[PDB]
Amino acid sequence: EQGFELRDEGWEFGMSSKVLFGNNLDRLNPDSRNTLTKIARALLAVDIDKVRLEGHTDNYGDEGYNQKLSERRAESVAAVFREAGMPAANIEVRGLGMSKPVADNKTRAGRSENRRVAIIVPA
Amino acid sequence: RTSIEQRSNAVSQVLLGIFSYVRWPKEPAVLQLCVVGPTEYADGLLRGMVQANGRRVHAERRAVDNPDLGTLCNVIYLGVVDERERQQVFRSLAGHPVLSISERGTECSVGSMFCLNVGGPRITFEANLDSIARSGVRVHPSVLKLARRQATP
């Protein structure tokens, strides 16, 4: 329970840390590009050197295309992690396409939150 | 290998660690822990716990089809659920600052922040940071040391 001693430093997993993408875009606006560098630096400082990147699309489109879309999104994020020190092999890339939503696609808001890469840290 | 007994108490300890790296924006006086759905190793937590920081953990078992889970629980330890159930529960929580942790570690692509791997010589977990970022609770990155501290012999 050593986590209680933690003051205000290094809390880089807040609401801002979401990795979202514009409609049909697979490349990181420099806002998120930075968000990622922060994150990737944050992971390295705690001796984690390996993650899995899972890309998703929203609803619009045929699955095949969105699958391919999602994978690209993931790989765009992977490059940042590469440029931040993480061995590329230690960076698994997966594309889940429109199959696994986190939000209501019946809503514009939701759809934005669905076009995301999700950083998972494996044990 | 190990015993269900032992492993239960282990889930207790690894949970309690994770809590220490988490911050509720409006920190309650008693942490409310909801065990939801089928569980193998929540017997320990169901006995109740107390944090290192004074706060007691009040833990009850709760029903998958309860809508108000999000206001009833600060900490949800999620049991075995199919995809539909899992969706319902996370609609229950959507919005409210609620930490979330699974007993099994196969379901970590959407949903819980932490997913446990409990069989085997040490307890670990996978962490989903989108899930974390979405949570609405503040979780510090150094918590990730709890998963590899035991994945290292």
Ligand SMILES: Nc1nc2c(ncn2[C@@H]2O[C@H](COP(=O)(O)O)[C@@H](O)[C@H]2O)c(=O)[nH]1
């Ligand atoms: N440890 C602790 N920190 C608190 C508590 N209440 C507020 N804070 C502070 O609230 C701040 C978080 O601000 P925020 O994330 O909303 O921008 C941190 O400075 C955090 O330490 C509390 O009850 N305990």
